[PDB]
Amino acid sequence: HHSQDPMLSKDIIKLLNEQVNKEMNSSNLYMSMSSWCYTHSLDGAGLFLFDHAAEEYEHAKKLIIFLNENNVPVQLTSISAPEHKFEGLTQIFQKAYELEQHISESINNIVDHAIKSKDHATFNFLQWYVAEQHEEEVLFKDILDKIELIGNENHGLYLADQYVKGIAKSRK
Amino acid sequence: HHSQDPMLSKDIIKLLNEQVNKEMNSSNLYMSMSSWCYTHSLDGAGLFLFDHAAEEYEHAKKLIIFLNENNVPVQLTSISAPEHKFEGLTQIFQKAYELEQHISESINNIVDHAIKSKDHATFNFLQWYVAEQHEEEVLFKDILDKIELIGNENHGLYLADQYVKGIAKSRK
Amino acid sequence: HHSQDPMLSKDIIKLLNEQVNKEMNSSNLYMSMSSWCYTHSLDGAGLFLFDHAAEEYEHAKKLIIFLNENNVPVQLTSISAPEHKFEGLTQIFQKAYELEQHISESINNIVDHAIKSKDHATFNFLQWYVAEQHEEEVLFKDILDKIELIGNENHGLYLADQYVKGIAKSRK
Amino acid sequence: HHSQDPMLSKDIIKLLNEQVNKEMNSSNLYMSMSSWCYTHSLDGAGLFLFDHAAEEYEHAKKLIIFLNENNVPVQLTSISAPEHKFEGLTQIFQKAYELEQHISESINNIVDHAIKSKDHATFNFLQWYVAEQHEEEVLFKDILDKIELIGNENHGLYLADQYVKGIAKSRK
Amino acid sequence: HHSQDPMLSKDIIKLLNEQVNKEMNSSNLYMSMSSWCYTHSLDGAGLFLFDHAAEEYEHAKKLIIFLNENNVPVQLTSISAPEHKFEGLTQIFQKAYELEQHISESINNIVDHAIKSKDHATFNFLQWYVAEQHEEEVLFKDILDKIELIGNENHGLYLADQYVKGIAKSRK
Amino acid sequence: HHSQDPMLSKDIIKLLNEQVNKEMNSSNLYMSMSSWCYTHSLDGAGLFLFDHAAEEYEHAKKLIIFLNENNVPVQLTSISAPEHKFEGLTQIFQKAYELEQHISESINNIVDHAIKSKDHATFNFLQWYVAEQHEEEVLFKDILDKIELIGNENHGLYLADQYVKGIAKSRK
Ligand SMILES: [Fe+3]
Ligand SMILES: [Fe+3]
Ligand SMILES: [Fe+3]
C-alpha cells in the first residue's frame, strides 16, 4: 500500500528532527540539575527543575506530533549524557539561562528558515512554541537575577531555594 | 553545608539508575515505532505507540522521583538512538512484546535484589511498578494475538490498525 | 460624498480577489465530486465532500469580509463549470489532495507577499487561514492514505466510505 | 456495483439544476452589490446584502441536498461575473427587488411543473422554499419602500442605511 | 549584585522605546481633540476620543511591560504638548484617521525589523498589537466615512455626534 | 452653534489644568522608577511602582472628566522626561515620598483656593482626591520606613523587594 510522501521540505525536516533531539537533551540535563539540587538540600530548585524538564519533554512531544501529522519520519538519534557535576545553585541557573538562550535561538533559526521557504504552515505552527519559549527564557532570567540578588551568605541559599520552591508551586 | 548521604545501598542504586536509562531507551524505541506506523498509514498503532512511549518515560520519571527522595544522585547515561527501520505492523508488535517481556524481567531482578538485601522500602515502592508493567505486558500480548488473528490478507491491516486505535482511545 | 480609499495595496488586492474566486471554484468542484459520490452509493464521501465544499465557500466569505472592511472592492469573476465526470473514490481523493496542496501554496504566496510589502495587517489576518488550510490539507492526506490502505478488494469501497462518513460526522 | 437511478423525472431534474445555478448567480450578485455599498460608506446595506447573499447560497445547498438524496446528479454550470458598477442605493435595491420577483416566479414555475407531472414529493419539498422566498421578496419590497420614502436629500442616505443596518442585525 | 543584560538588541530597543513615546504623544493629542469636542457640544465624539486616548496609553503600557520583562530600560522622553485648536468634527476625524495610518505603518516597520534581525519573540509579541491597531484604523476610517456621509447641513453634526456616541458606548 | 462658556473661574481652571499635567508627569516618573527596579532585579518594586503610576494616570483622567463636564478646555502641555538615573531602592522611595508630599500640597493649594473663591462644587469634587492622595502619601511613608528598617545588608534588598511585592499584590 502507498503512503503519502512527507508534506515538509528536506531542510525543515532536518531542523525539526534536530529540535526534537535538543528538547530531549534539555529535559535530561534539567533532570540532572534537579538531582544535583535534591542531593545538596535544595529541594525547591530540585522540584522547579524537575517540572521544567517535563515542560521541555512536552515540547519534544509536540514537535513529534507535528512531524507525525505531516507524514515526516521522526529519526531519533542519541540523547547525550547530561553534565552531572555542578559548583552550586548560581552556576546551575547561569548554565540554565545560557541554555534557554541557545534554545530560543535554535527556534528562531527554524522560524527564519520557514519564512525563506515560504513554509507558513510550519511558521504558524511554531509561533506557539516561540511564545512559550520566550516566557521560559524570561523565567530563567528572573530566577537567575533573584539568586544573584539574594547571594549565598549565611541563609541566602535557603532563601533562594524557598523563592524557587514558590515559583515551582505557583506554576503547577 | 552537609546534605545527608544516599539512603539506599550501592547495588540497589546501580540497578535503579540502570532501569531509568532502560525506560528511557524503550521510550525512544516506541517513539520510533510509532513514527514508522504514522508514515505507513497506520495511525491507530501510531497513536497507541506514541501514548505508550510517553507512559514509559513516566516510569523513568517515577524512578527518578524515588531516587531524589532518597538523596540518591540520578545517573543519566546517553540514551541509545533507536532502530528506525521496521518490516511491518506484525514485526513491530512482536519486537514490542519481546521488549515488554524483558522490561518485566528487569524489574523482577531489582525486586528480588531488594528482598535479598532486605530493602523493603524499595520492595514496597516497586510493587506498584510490577503491577503496572504486568498490565502493559498483557496488553502487548493481547495486541499481538489480535494482529496475528486478523492477518494481513485484504484489509486485515486496516482492521488491525482500527482495533489498536480503539485500544489507544479507550486507555486515554 | 467621499468614501475613504482602499486600505490595501494594488498587488495585495489582486491576490486577495483572485483567492476569493479560487475558493468559489474549489467549492463548486467539491460539490460536483460530492454529487458523484452520492450517485454512486458513496454517501459517506458525498457528505464529507459536501460539507468540505461548504467550508471552502466559508473561506471565500471570510476573505470577502476582510476586503469589505478595508474598503476594497470585491471583483468576482466567472466561476467555470466544475469537472463532473470522475473514475472513482480514489481518483476523486487524489485530485482533491492535489487541489488542497495547490491551495496551501496559493495562500503561502499571498502571505509571503504581505511579508515582503510590510503589510502585516494582512499577514496577521491570513494566519488563521494558513492554520485552517493546513489542517484540511492534512485531512485529505489522511483520507487518501486510508483509502489506499483499505483498497478496493471486495467490500473495500464500503469500508472506505464508512470510514469517511465517520470523519464527516465527527467534524460537524 | 449498481447504484439506483435518479428518483426524479428529467424535466424536474433540469429545472431544479437551473434553480441551483440561479441561486449561486444571485448570491454572487448580492456579494457584488454588498461590496459597492461597503465601498460607498453604506455599511448598513453592505451587511444586509452580504447576509442575504449567504442565505441565497444556503438555498442552493438545500436544493443540492434534495438532488443528492434523490440520486440525481448535480450539474453546476458556469456562474457568470456579476455586475459590479451601480448607480446608487435606490438602484441597487430596485434591481434586487426585480431579481427577487424573478426568483419567486422561477420557483412558482417549478412547483407548477411538479403539479403537472404529479411529482408531489417535489411539490412538498418546495413548499418551505416558496414560503421563505416570499418572505424575502416582501422584505426587499419593504426596504425599497422605505428607501423611496426617505429620499436622498439630505442625510437621507445615512438614515436609509441605518434603517437597513437595523434590519440586518434584527434578522441574523 | 549583577542583573542580566537586556534580552533584545539595540535596534529593536530603540524602535520599541520610540513607539512607547509615540503612543503617549498620540494619547495626549486624542485627549486634546476630545476636549475640543466636549467644549463644542459634541459629547459623543468627546467620549469616543477620551476612551480612545485611554486605550492608546494602554498600548504604551503594554510595550513598557514587554520592555521590563526583557530587562530593557524604558527610555521615556518628553511628551509633546498636543495641538489644542481644531476647525471642526470633520477635520478632527481626518487628522485622527491620518494619525492611525501613521501608527499602523510605525508598527509595520518594527515588525519588519524583527523578522529581518530574526527576533521572533518580538515578532510574536507584536502580532497582537498589529491586529488591535488594524481594528482601530478601520474604525477611524468607518467613522470618517460616516461623518462625511451625514454632512453638516442642518442637524448633521448632531446626528454624526450621536452616531459616534453609539460607537463609544458599544465598545465599552 | 453656541456652546456654553466654562462653568469654572479662570484661576481654578489654570490650577486644575496644571494638576492634570502633574499627575501625567508623576505617572511617567513612576514608570521610570519602575523600570529602574525591573532592570536591577527588583521586580517587586517594579510591579508596585508600575501599578502606582497607573493610579496617578487615573487621577489625571478624573480631573480631565471634571474639566470636560464643566465645559473647560483641557490645555495639555508637555509631559517632562522623567529622571531615569537612580542610586538604589532607598533613594527611589525617598524621592517617591517627597513627590507624594509635593502632590498632597498641590491639592491643598487648589482646595484652599476653592474655599476662597467659594467654588464648593470644586471643593466637594476634590475631597475624594484629597482622601485618596492622603492614603497614597501614607503608603509611601510606610514603604520608605520599611525599606529603611530592613536595610541593605546581605539579603536586605531581597527582603525589601519581597515586602513591596506583597503590597503590590495586596492592592490589586
Ligand atoms: Fe512497559
Ligand atoms: Fe433625523
Ligand atoms: Fe491606535
Provide the resolution (angstroms): 2.0
Q: Which residues of A89-112 are buried (b: 16+ CB within 10 A; e: fewer)?
A: bbebbbbbbebbeebbebbbebbb
Q: Which among D1, D38, D41 has CB closest to C41?
A: D1
CB-based contact E103:E133 (threshold 8 Å): yes
Pick the closest to residue B61 from A54, D107, D57 (CA basis). Answer: A54
Q: How far apart are the first and last CA of chain E?
A: 45
Distance CA F24, CA E122 (A): 28
Which residue matches cell numbers 468634527?
A: E89
Pick the closest to residue C37 from C100, C95, C79, C104 (CA basis). Answer: C95
- Counting Cβ atoms within 10 Å, is residue D117 exposed (0-12), middle (13-18) or buried (19+)? middle
Residue list, annotated binding site of F: 23, 56, 59, 100, 133
What residues of D are in contact with residue E142 (Cβ under 8 Å)?
A: 43
C-alpha cell at C45: 464521501
In sign, the C-alpha dihedral spanning C44, C48, C49, C50 is positive
Question: Where is chain B broken, named by the residue before each break, C–N > 2.5 Å?
Answer: none
CB-based contact A140:A96 (threshold 8 Å): yes
CB-based contact E40:E158 (threshold 8 Å): no
Distance CA A100, CA A139 (A): 10
What residues of F are in contact with residue E76 (Cβ under 8 Å)?
A: 28, 31-32, 81-82, 84
Question: Which residues, 6+ apart, have CB-to-CB distance to A129 below 8 Å?
Answer: A59, A62, A63, A107
What residues of E are in contact with residue F24 (Cβ under 8 Å)?
A: 28, 79
Distance CA C92, CA C44 (A): 13
Task: Report how far apart, in Å, the C-alpha atoms of B161 and of each of A3, B50, B60, B150, F121 are.
Answer: 15, 14, 28, 10, 80
Which residue matches cell numbers 519588519?
A: E112
Q: Which among F41, F43, F154 has CB closest to A153?
A: F154
Q: Which among C118, C121, C127 has CB closest to E134?
A: C121
In the reported structure, the alpha carbon of residue E77 is separated from the centroid of ligand 3 by a whole-number distance in angstroms of: 20
Q: Does D18 touch chain C (CB under 8 A)?
A: no
User: Count of A–F CB contacts within 8 Å?
Assistant: 22
Which residue matches cell numbers 502487548?
A: B140
Task: Decide if A120 and C141 are in contact by the 8 Å CB cutoff.
Answer: no
Question: Which residues, 6+ apart, have CB-to-CB distance to D46 below 8 Å?
Answer: C68, D34, D35, D37, D38
For an interface test with A, give the residue of C111, C129, C153 to mutate (most A CBs within 10 A). C111
Task: Name the minimum distance, in Å, from the CA of E130 to any CA of chain C.
Answer: 6
Which residues span the domain enclosing F33?
Answer: 1-172
Q: Which residues of B147-163 are buried (b: 16+ CB within 10 A; e: fewer)?
A: beebeeeebebbbbbbb
Half-sphere exposure of B137 (CA within 13 A, CB side): 16
∠ CA E96-E100-E101 to the nearest 5 degrees? 115
Task: Decide if A1 and C149 are in contact by the 8 Å CB cutoff.
Answer: yes
Distance CA D130, CA B26 (A): 66
| DSSP E strand stretches across B21-166 | none
C-alpha cell at F151: 536595610
Q: Which among F43, F154, F161 has CB closest to A151?
A: F154
Which DSSP letter does residue D41 get? T
In the reported structure, the alpha carbon of residue E106 is separated from the centroid of ligand 3 by a whole-number distance in angstroms of: 11
Amino acid at A27: S
Task: Decide if C3 and D41 are in contact by the 8 Å CB cutoff.
Answer: yes
Which ligand is the nearest neighbour of the Cα of E56? 3
Task: Decide if C28 and D79 are in contact by the 8 Å CB cutoff.
Answer: yes
Distance CA A15, CA C141 (A): 23
Distance CA A114, CA C111 (A): 12
Task: Report how far apart, in Å, the C-alpha atoms of F139 and of each of F49, F97, F107, F146, F164 are.
Answer: 12, 9, 17, 11, 11
CB contact residues (below 8 A), chain A span 130-169, against chain F:
142, 145-146, 148-151, 153-156, 159
Task: Decide if D78 and C80 are in contact by the 8 Å CB cutoff.
Answer: yes
Report the SS3 class of residue A143: helix
Report the SS3 class of residue C71: coil
Name E79's bridge partners: F79
CA dihedral D110→D115→D116→D119, nearest 10 degrees, is: 90
Name A79's bridge partners: B79
Which residue matches cell numbers 486624542?
A: E30
Which residue matches cell numbers 426617505?
A: D150
| DSSP one-letter string for D85-108 | ----HHHHHHHHHHHHHHHHHHHH
Phi/psi zone of residue C86: left (φ > 0), alpha (ψ -120 to 50 degrees), beta? beta
∠ CA B74-B76-B80 to the nearest 5 degrees? 160
F-contacting chains (≥3 CB pairs under 8 Å) = A, E
- Counting Cβ atoms within 10 Å, is residue C103 exposed (0-12), middle (13-18) or buried (19+)? buried
CB-based contact C163:C150 (threshold 8 Å): yes
Question: Which residues, 6+ apart, have CB-to-CB distance to A27 below 8 Å?
Answer: A53, A54, A56, A57, A60
Q: How far apart are the first and last CA of chain A?
A: 45
Distance CA B140, CA A8 (A): 33
Task: Report how far apart, in Å, the C-alpha atoms of F63 and of each of F53, F67, F74 are.
Answer: 16, 6, 9
Distance CA E87, CA C114 (A): 37
List, as own/partner pairs, every contact residues E37-43 make where C-beta atoms lie below 8 angstroms and the sequence separation is at least 24, other chains included. Answer: E37/E89, E37/E92, E38/F68, E38/F71, E39/F3, E39/F6, E39/F68, E39/F71, E39/F72, E39/F73, E40/F1, E40/F3, E41/E161, E41/F1, E41/F3, E42/E89, E42/E157, E42/E161, E42/E164, E43/E161, E43/E165
C-alpha cell at E7: 534580552
Q: Does C107 touch chain D (CB under 8 A)?
A: no
Report the SS3 class of residue A12: helix
What residues of B are in contact with residue C151 (Cβ under 8 Å)?
A: 154-155
Distance CA D84, CA C76 (A): 8
CA dihedral A89→A91→A97→A101, nearest 10 degrees, is: -160
C-alpha cell at A7: 508534506
∠ CA C109-C111-C115 to the nearest 5 degrees? 115
In the reported structure, the alpha carbon of residue E49 is separated from the centroid of ligand 2 by a whole-number distance in angstroms of: 24
| DSSP one-letter string for E48-85 | HHHHHHHHHHHHHHHHHHHHHHTTPPP---PBPPPP--
Residues in chain F, total:
172
Which ligand is the nearest neighbour of the Cα of B104? 1
Name D79's bridge partners: C79
Question: Which residues, 6+ apart, have CB-to-CB distance to E85 below 8 Å?
Answer: E36
**B167 C-beta neighbours (distance < 10 Å), count:** 17
Task: Report how far apart, in Å, the C-alpha atoms of C16 and of each of C101, C107, C137, E54, E130 are.
Answer: 18, 9, 20, 34, 19
C-alpha cell at A77: 538519534
Q: Which among A3, A24, A67 has CB closest to B41?
A: A3
Task: Decide if A153 and F155 are in contact by the 8 Å CB cutoff.
Answer: yes
Amino acid at A94: Q
Pick the closest to residue A164 from A30, A54, A55, A37 (CA basis). Answer: A37
Q: Which residues of D52-91 are buried (b: 16+ CB within 10 A; e: fewer)?
A: bbbbbbebbbbbbebbbebbbbbbbbebeebeeeeeebbe
Amino acid at E8: L
C-alpha cell at A142: 528572573
Q: Does E112 touch chain A (CB under 8 A)?
A: no
- Counting Cβ atoms within 10 Å, is residue C114 exposed (0-12), middle (13-18) or buried (19+)? buried
Longest dimension (CA), chain C: 69
CB-based contact C168:C48 (threshold 8 Å): yes
Which DSSP letter does residue F79 get? B
Which ligand is the nearest neighbour of the Cα of E154? 2
Distance CA B51, CA A117 (A): 32
CB-based contact B56:B26 (threshold 8 Å): yes
C-alpha cell at D154: 439630505
Q: What are phi and psi of E107, to 5 degrees?
A: -65, -40
Task: Name the minimum distance, in Å, from the CA of E150 to any CA of chain D.
Answer: 5
In sign, the C-alpha dihedral spanning B20, B23, B27, B33 is positive
Provide the domain count of chain C: 1
| DSSP one-letter string for E85-123 | --S-HHHHHHHHHHHHHHHHHHHHHHHHHHHHTT-HHHH
Which ligand is the nearest neighbour of the Cα of B134? 1
Which DSSP letter does residue B153 get? S
Distance CA D58, CA C45 (A): 20
CB-based contact A96:C83 (threshold 8 Å): no
Task: Decide if C118 and E112 are in contact by the 8 Å CB cutoff.
Answer: yes
Q: CATH code at D1?
A: 1.20.1260.10
CB-based contact E4:A141 (threshold 8 Å): yes
State which residue of chain F sits closest to A146, comparing Cα positions.
F41
Task: Decide if D41 and E151 are in contact by the 8 Å CB cutoff.
Answer: no
Question: Which residues, 6+ apart, have CB-to-CB distance to A16 below 8 Å?
Answer: A8, A63, A66, A67, A72, A110, A122
Pick the closest to residue F89 from F169, F165, F170, F21 (CA basis). Answer: F165
CA B6 to chain centroid, in Å, comes to 26
Method by which the coordinates were obtained: X-ray
Q: Does D23 touch chain E (CB under 8 A)?
A: no
Q: Does A1 touch chain B (CB under 8 A)?
A: yes
Phi/psi zone of residue E123: left (φ > 0), alpha (ψ -120 to 50 degrees), beta? alpha
In sign, the C-alpha dihedral spanning B111, B114, B118, B122 is negative
Q: How far apart are the first and last CA of chain F?
A: 45
In sign, the C-alpha dihedral spanning E120, E125, E128, E129 is negative
Which ligand is the nearest neighbour of the Cα of E54? 3
Longest dimension (CA), chain D: 69
Q: Does C5 touch chain E (CB under 8 A)?
A: no
Residue list, annotated binding site of E: 23, 56, 59, 100, 133
In sign, the C-alpha dihedral spanning E68, E70, E75, E76 is negative
C-alpha cell at E153: 447641513
CB-based contact D34:D40 (threshold 8 Å): no
Distance CA C48, CA C30 (A): 9
Question: Which residues, 6+ apart, have CB-to-CB distance to B111 below 8 Å?
Answer: B123, B126, B127, B130
